[PDB]
Ligand SMILES: N[C@@H](CSOO)C(=O)O
């Protein structure tokens with residue numbers, strides 16, 4: 001505070017560095033500033049590198065170690081596993097298109113079908129928030145005709161998580177990778 005409207009992606013990044021200067025996170029403030037940034041495709045084209053077969057993760061800023069800010073690019077029909085967020089805050093702001101978010105409870109030790117809690121459609125410029133205390137989720141671009149682009153902020157940064165088998169609740173550890181960093185493809 002004061003929380004001012006980010007004028008550009010670069011301005012948003014500057015404001016985020018201020019909000020993450022300390023050791024804690026004001027979730028509502030971070031969400032509000034992410035929401036207030038009006039997506040401008042020209043500002044993030046550099047990062048919007050798609051793959052034909054699955055969604056991509058494109059690192060934008062390393063947050064001076066406090067957070068990772070990245071752009072995810074979802075082709076038509078591309079989605080995630082049901083997954084957690086490794087004891088981190090996770091903000092998801094739509095830059096282009098729409099994504100379906102399905103929420104799930106943490107499974108019990110007992111093998112069982114994971115039934116959805118709820119679902120919603122996240123629309124252009126909206127910012128959602130998740131953490132492990134809230135639950136697990138799947139995120140999907142269910143469109144047949146429109147790619148989706150989202151802006152994700154994780155604090156602290158993390159590069160592993162778990163994917164959950166919808167049929168059993170069984171989890172496995174996954175290492176996350178980056179498709180690009182700072183606009184540069186990182187095979
Ligand atoms: N957590 C997923 C995206 S859905 O997360 O908000 C990822 O970073 O790949």
Ligand SMILES: [Fe+2]
Pocket residue numbers: 083084085090137139
């Ligand atoms: Fe997620």
